[PDB]
């Protein structure tokens, strides 16, 4: 999944 700080 997306990193904590990605869109």
């Amino acid at each position, epitope marked *: 999944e997306n990193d904590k*700080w*990605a869109s």
Partner: antibody
Amino acid sequence: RITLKESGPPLVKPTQTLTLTCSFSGFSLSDFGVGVGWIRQPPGKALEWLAIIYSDDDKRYSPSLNTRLTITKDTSKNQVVLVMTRVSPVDTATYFCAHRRGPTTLFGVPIARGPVNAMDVWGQGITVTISS
Amino acid sequence: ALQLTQSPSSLSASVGDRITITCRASQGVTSALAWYRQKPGSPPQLLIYDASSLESGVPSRFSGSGSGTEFTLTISTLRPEDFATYYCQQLHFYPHTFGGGTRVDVRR
């Protein structure tokens, strides 16, 4: 100045449970968006990412090791613990914990996320050997 | 999962050379990429964060560029302490992958 240091048993036997502790100073796991992760390095091999935990308590794990890892934090003791169950010889490696910055804030308003893209300070690493 | 391939895996050079190491990702990771230098017996040390920002206290001969799927680290004037192994790390997708590393050793 941020510093981290790993501690735990240098030797562990197959099928046993390995508990590693990262004690740090210079930041709090209650600071905004901060993270502490664990990375390992078998002798002579590449770095391998294991897990990370943030101050808001979100946790993420390597999919390959998910079933054997538990990461937890103890904010008041400034420690992060990683528990790996059912170890086997291939788990022998040097284990490092590391700091991950949270976004920069201005008057408590997040304005820059570029600083979260790296693990900026590392502990010296602790060597763990798995053998019966 | 996402693959990060470093090139070259090994590289020989001499003090004063300019070297450039590259890292390619299987899917775009935007600018969420970091470079590290690791000397034997020590932990990796952060050189460049967010693909191109110079980490504080890191010497200016180190430079990083690129975004998306292709990144490069260049050391403009190799110093003796740079004979080491370099790694790139992606932080856009979990798990936060590391490349295979590139060993930089004394040419002869």
